[PDB]
Ligand binder design. Structure first.
Ligand SMILES: CCCCCCCCCCCCCCCCCC(=O)OC[C@H](COP(=O)([O-])OCC(O)COP(=O)([O-])OC[C@@H](COC(=O)CCCCCCCCCCCCCCCCC)OC(=O)CCCCCCCCCCCCCCCCC)OC(=O)CCCCCCCCCCCCCCCCC
Ligand SMILES: CCCCCCCCCCCCCCCCCC(=O)OC[C@H](COP(=O)([O-])OCC(O)COP(=O)([O-])OC[C@@H](COC(=O)CCCCCCCCCCCCCCCCC)OC(=O)CCCCCCCCCCCCCCCCC)OC(=O)CCCCCCCCCCCCCCCCC
Ligand code: HEM
Ligand code: HEM
Ligand code: HEM
Ligand code: HEM
Ligand SMILES: C/C=C(C)/C=C/C=C/[C@H](OC)[C@@H](C)[C@@H](OC)[C@@H](C)CCc1oc2c(O)c(OC)cc(OC)c2c(=O)c1C
Ligand SMILES: C/C=C(C)/C=C/C=C/[C@H](OC)[C@@H](C)[C@@H](OC)[C@@H](C)CCc1oc2c(O)c(OC)cc(OC)c2c(=O)c1C
Ligand SMILES: COC1=C(OC)C(=O)C(CC=C(C)C)=C(C)C1=O
Ligand SMILES: COC1=C(OC)C(=O)C(CC=C(C)C)=C(C)C1=O
Lengths: 48, 42, 62, 22, 85, 370, 99, 365
């Protein structure tokens, strides 16, 4: 009923390993770019 | 030429000190350049 | 008077765009070989004795 | 100018890519 | 190079500019650098040198940016940073 | 070439604070492309004749190189499509995004078109669920007075679901996704006139950031998570969201005793099943989806988002819990006490949207003195 | 307890935790946009800053220290006199539009 | 609006400018009849031919939809060739983007019609699929691999028919998107006109002037199409495709669809595999070179006698090649075809650019 049984699991192992690598790396790339905004500081200086 | 003008034009005074020197004292002169900001003296 | 690994990786590999690309091409072909061999070994070990490649010797001669 | 050296690493890339990828 | 030569000599015109070049140069270089030396320094600059020196200071380096006025359109820093390569 | 790629992406102004709930729009774009790509490749090996449809699908899964992964990616991708669709609609309701009337109403059309599209695709493998799903759903039209039955037979190409039906459904399923793509581009064009809403419901014109690189990288991260969810299903549990009965070829003489709809249609099926009247159930079904077009007219709050509205939030989660209840009931037999739970859940669904939420809105306004 | 529940509600709503005043959170329709356009410089600039400050906190999924939360008793409607007049003017036009 | 209603148009464009809208109509017609045929067509080799006869014999009005689709493809090419001819003669190719997209459109329509012809799986369907895909085998080192990959096997078979239905199904919609881009680039400049002189001093609104003229043109297109469908549906077709595909036998007088005959004559004139394929590709791709070969100081051929004479020689030559493509590879047709093939490239690459220069000289500029 499922001749692809063993192959999908071997692939699934590779998918999990690749995601274990790519997810935190892309997340690191996301935080790198966003750091410009996350640490930005604002100040309001109206005339008075 | 090579030297940019003291003030580049485009299109602040609140004290005596900053005002001294503002009064004109000589006839007017107008300059135009190829490489330098224009000026008008006096 | 001595740099760090990342500083060296920067200077020789990442700075120039032509070299940042050659680095990825090369790294990709090397990673592919090591990753596939490694993951395949993990999969086959988790399933030791169950795969056709493990029992094949018993029937081969063809 | 820098184009030969750059066109020469761009050359390489394409080559390596095909070789490998294909 | 020609623009720079002309700026250097035309700037040192009059006693005030020369006097200032003397006072400031002794404090900055520890000596007065003569025009003939500036000429030698300028003469040796060629396209290769300009590329290498510019790359060293501008290429893939983080800039410092200051804006004032109607600056809604001043590009985001990340975009400015990527413009450096 | 530059512009409109761009000023329509690269320098597109975006709120600085949109959250992960805003990632579903791009995830829907990705689900659409995925379905289209895996769809075309499956269509290269699929044959729509009733004598060979089921067979061609097993041929894809057994003999076409990687045919199985493309097939299960298409099947599970349809599930991911709906998960994202429901998250996308939920985000819109909670944050008052529906006030962008054109964008919203086009969205309602998109939901209906994807539902119709997924329905027809499910019929293609010609298994038992394929056949009875084709039978039941097309028959919804028979509730139309005077011509209902005629419309059904015209759609079927005969007096019952047969060869003519399967062949035209392959054609409809083939083209509809591309029509969906064109409709989605219009969806986006109207959105671009206003730009995005944000969690606060307050205009973000005073704090916009460029879409690139902030949301381009955030969308890529989201895309990776979508792919992980999809592949966990394809590689570790490809049949989890499917139905065993569709592994049985279509049998026109016998409807499986525990026949039930695809999970993403269960809530609507529960609603229709709760009304012991033909026309009444069909109208309730249609209205359970079309009521989304009424949400904008039912907005009473002085505030756009539910972020600062406690009472509205409670009712919102009750609606979600209620849809979860209807989903569960749709998977249960028409027996006691499920028949009553489902009727209450069905009544509660329309009551929350038409009465309770608009009322919570007014009460909150009073509490804030405006 | 309506006034009692009111202060409770105000804090539950929580826009005060982002430093916003109630009027900063109103849904902008054409009446509101016209009212904001009519605001005097200082009220307009203050509004802009409070919204900007709130959007920034929202992006970081953070809130202000409790001592900086808008206080229920000090929140006032700066927009009301303007919006009320804008609405009155539109109603007047709508009445005239009937013959 | 402003993309139609108030679109500025030259006051003097002639009937030769009607083919663009007629191509749009041919495309819509093919899409409409195509979808309806796809509602009854099955792509399995065991039933493809059968499903087509079923459409023509038992589906209500199936026969008219089918012959409208078949003859519609012929009308599509008549219009395409008229459209390209207008462009060459009047110098419309100077609108570079519009022109090059047009070349892509021509190739895509050709590829599209090729695949559709394979669908009924008759004899011509089968051998056309065989020959044309094999053009790729001329590609060194990997050519044969590309062919087997396209076929899904070592020969044209089931896998081929099924994917061709899918390709033929989607390509026309891609053509529609490419055509919209074709028009967008055109709108940046507006239309050229018979004089080749800017018409900005005399523009008229597209509506009502060209909307009514296009409708009149559409009526004439429909008359031509229906004369073929109702009075001679097989006139432009090939009897051999009424015979189911037979992989063991290639009909002795096999010949391409009439709109491919000129190109087939060119390929057949060269007794070398790679050479023939290169000449075939070049006979179409040379259209992309026309702009670079323009030497005249004037845009249109209206005021250029010598250029006009060479233009009609090219049309007469394509007519010659079309005739030769329909004849057996025997004397004296082999030589007439070789001369005609050489004349084709010679007129475009050498004689026309030269006439352009001579005309400039005669006008003293
Ligand atoms: C499967 C289901 C089917 C659906 C398909 C999947 C699609 C997923 C939706 C798209 C969301 C992806 C995304 O863009 O993630 C951004 C988001 C990035 O968050 P962030 O960069 O840390 O933002 C900081 C917060 O604004 C500020 O928050 P903070 O400083 O308080 O820290 C929170 C953060 C760190 O806190 C800790 O956990 C420590 O925790 C995380 O967000 C991780 O990641 C998630 O929210 C995870 C997605 C969960 C799934
Ligand atoms: C096979 C290919 C099939 C492809 C599908 C068919 C494509 C048809 C192309 C579109 C042509 C129709 C069109 O819209 O052009 C109007 C075209 C322009 O003629 P017109 O409206 O009389 O314009 C007067 C001339 O500009 C002023 O010139 P004129 O004073 O010398 O008068 C010319 C006119 C009247 O002269 C006489 O014959 C008298 O002769 C006719 O054209 C009739 O009329 C036709 O060719 C069709 C008339 C049929 C009724
Ligand atoms: C094939 C289906 C759909 C696609 C491809 C799609 C895509 C998108 C995209 C790319 C955005 C911008 C990013 C975002 O905010 O998520 C968006 C926004 C939006 N969509 Fe959709 N959408 C789909 C279905 C729907 C449905 C079913 C509804 C609602 C009935 C809808 C309502 C909205 C609204 C109102 C917005 C504005 C969001 C905001 O700014 O707060 N969409 N959609
Ligand atoms: C909105 C996009 C689409 C959705 C939601 C969708 C949904 C579905 C569903 C639910 C099925 C049944 C899967 C199963 O076997 O369990 C299916 C089958 C199928 N779809 Fe799609 N589809 C989409 C796009 C496409 C496109 C664009 C094509 C082809 C050009 C296509 C071709 C097919 C084919 C050949 C099948 C039959 C083989 C199979 O069952 O896997 N689909 N589709
Ligand atoms: C699916 C095929 C095609 C469609 C639907 C199409 C449609 C159009 C339309 C609507 C026009 C405007 C009306 C006219 O002047 O005729 C036009 C103009 C033009 N087309 Fe096409 N076209 C197609 C193929 C091509 C091809 C194959 C070429 C040439 C290789 C081409 C070259 C041009 C040029 C240069 C113009 C400007 C004509 C002028 O203003 O004189 N077109 N096309
Ligand atoms: C650029 C547009 C198109 C062209 C030039 C075209 C051309 C053709 C040609 C030459 C044939 C062979 C006709 C014969 O002798 O039987 C054919 C067959 C067919 N075409 Fe198309 N076609 C177009 C668009 C479409 C579309 C959009 C569909 C379907 C979605 C379609 C569906 C069919 C079907 C199912 C057949 C097989 C039945 C038959 O042979 O009549 N075509 N097409
Ligand atoms: C030619 C094209 C046609 C006729 C398209 C029609 C499309 C109609 C709607 O889409 C817009 C429709 C799919 C959508 O209604 C809003 C669904 C929520 C309806 C869900 C639905 O599913 C079932 C199902 O899947 C089954 O499977 C085995 C069996 C079923 O009962 C035995 C049902 C069922 O009782 C209902 C209500
Ligand atoms: C998967 C898609 C694929 C592989 C698409 C390939 C498209 C290729 C080209 O279109 C761009 C191609 C159609 C176009 O070449 C420019 C034509 C003018 C080629 C004309 C052509 O037709 C023949 C034909 O029809 C036949 O019928 C029974 C038989 C034939 O010889 C026995 C030929 C033939 O010898 C040639 C040259
Ligand atoms: C800001 O609104 C939009 C998105 O949401 C972040 C998108 O993902 C995409 C993709 C587009 C085109 C867009 O306009
Ligand atoms: C300006 O050129 C155009 C035409 O030529 C007369 C058309 O027929 C049509 C139809 C369109 C849309 C167009 O843009």
């Amino acid at each position: 009923a499922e001749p692809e049984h063993d192959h999908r699991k071997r692939m699934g192992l590779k998918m999990l390993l690749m995601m274990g690598l790519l997810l935190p790396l892309v997340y690191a790339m996301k935080r790198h770019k966003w750091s410009v905004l996350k640490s930005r500081k604002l100040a309001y200086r109206p005339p008075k | 030429a090579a030297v940019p003008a003291t003030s580049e034009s485009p299109v602040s005074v609140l004290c005596r000190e900053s005002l001294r020197g503002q009064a004109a004292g000589r006839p007017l002169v107008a300059s135009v350049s190829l490489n330098v900001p224009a000026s008008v003296r006096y | 008077v001595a740099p760090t690994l990342t500083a060296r990786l920067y200077s020789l590999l990442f700075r120039r765009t032509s070299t940042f690309a050659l680095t990825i091409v090369v790294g990709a072909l090397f990673f592919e070989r090591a990753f596939d061999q490694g993951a395949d070994a993990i999969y086959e070990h988790i399933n030791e004795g169950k795969l056709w490649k493990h029992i094949k010797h018993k029937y081969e001669n063809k | 100018r820098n184009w030969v050296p750059t066109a020469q690493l761009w050359g390489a890339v394409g080559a390596v890519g095909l070789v490998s990828a294909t | 190079k020609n623009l720079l030569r002309n700026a250097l000599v035309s700037h040192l015109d009059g006693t005030t500019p020369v006097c200032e070049d003397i006072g400031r140069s002794l404090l900055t270089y520890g000596r007065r650098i003569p025009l003939a030396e500036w000429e030698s320094r300028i003469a040796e600059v060629d396209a290769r040198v300009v590329r290498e020196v510019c790359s060293k200071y501008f290429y893939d380096q983080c800039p410092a940016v200051a804006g004032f006025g109607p600056i809604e359109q001043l590009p985001d820093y990340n975009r400015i940073r990527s413009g450096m390569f | 070439l530059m512009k409109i790629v761009n000023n329509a992406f690269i320098d597109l102004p975006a709120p600085s604070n949109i959250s992960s709930w805003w990632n579903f729009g791009s995830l829907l774009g990705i689900c659409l492309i995925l379905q289209i790509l895996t769809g075309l490749f499956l269509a290269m090996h699929y044959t729509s004749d009733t004598t060979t449809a089921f067979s061609s699908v097993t041929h894809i899964c057994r003999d076409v190189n990687y045919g199985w992964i493309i097939r299960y990616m298409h099947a599970n991708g349809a599930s991911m499509f709906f998960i994202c669709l429901y998250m996308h609609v939920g985000r819109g309701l909670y944050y008052g995004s529906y006030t962008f009337l054109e964008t919203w109403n086009i969205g309602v059309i998109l939901l209906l078109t994807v539902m119709a599209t997924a329905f027809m695709g499910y019929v293609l493998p010609w298994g038992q669920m394929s056949f009875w799903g084709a039978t039941v759903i097309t028959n919804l039209l028979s509730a139309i007075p005077y011509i209902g039955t005629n419309l059904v037979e015209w759609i079927w190409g005969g007096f019952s679901v047969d060869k003519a039906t399967l062949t035209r459904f392959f054609a409809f399923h083939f083209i509809l996704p591309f029509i969906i793509m064109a409709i989605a581009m219009v969806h986006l064009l109207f959105l671009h006139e206003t730009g995005s809403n944000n969690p606060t419901g307050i205009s973000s014109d005073v704090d916009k950031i460029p879409f690139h690189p902030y949301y381009t990288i955030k969308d890529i991260l989201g895309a990776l998570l979508l792919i992980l969810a999809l592949m966990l299903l394809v590689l570790f549990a490809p049949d989890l969201l499917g139905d065993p009965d569709n592994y049985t070829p279509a049998n026109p003489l016998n409807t499986p005793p525990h026949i039930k709809p695809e999970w993403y249609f269960l809530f609507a099926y529960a609603i229709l099943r709760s009304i012991p009247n033909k026309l009444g159930g069909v109208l309730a079904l249609a209205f359970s989806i079309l009521i989304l077009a009424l949400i904008p007219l039912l907005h009473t709050s002085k505030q756009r988002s539910m972020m600062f509205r406690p009472l509205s939030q409670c009712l919102f989660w009750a609606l979600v819990a209620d849809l979860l209840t209807l989903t569960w009931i749709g998977g249960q037999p028409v027996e006691h006490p499920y028949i009553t739970i489902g009727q209450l859940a069905s009544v509660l669904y329309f009551l929350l949207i038409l009465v309770l939420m608009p009322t919570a809105g007014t009460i909150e306004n009073k509490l804030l003195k405006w | 307890w309506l006034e009692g529940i009111r202060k409770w509600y105000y804090n539950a709503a929580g826009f005060n935790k982002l430093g916003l005043m109630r009027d900063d959170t109103i849904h902008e329709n054409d009446d509101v946009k016209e009212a904001i356009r009519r605001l005097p410089e200082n009220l307009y600039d203050d509004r802009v800053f409070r919204i900007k400050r709130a959007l920034d906190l929202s992006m970081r999924q953070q809130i202000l220290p409790k001592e900086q939360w808008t206080k229920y008793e000090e929140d006032k409607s700066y927009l009301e006199p303007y919006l009320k007049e804008v609405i009155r003017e539109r109603k007047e036009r709508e009445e005239w539009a009937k013959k």
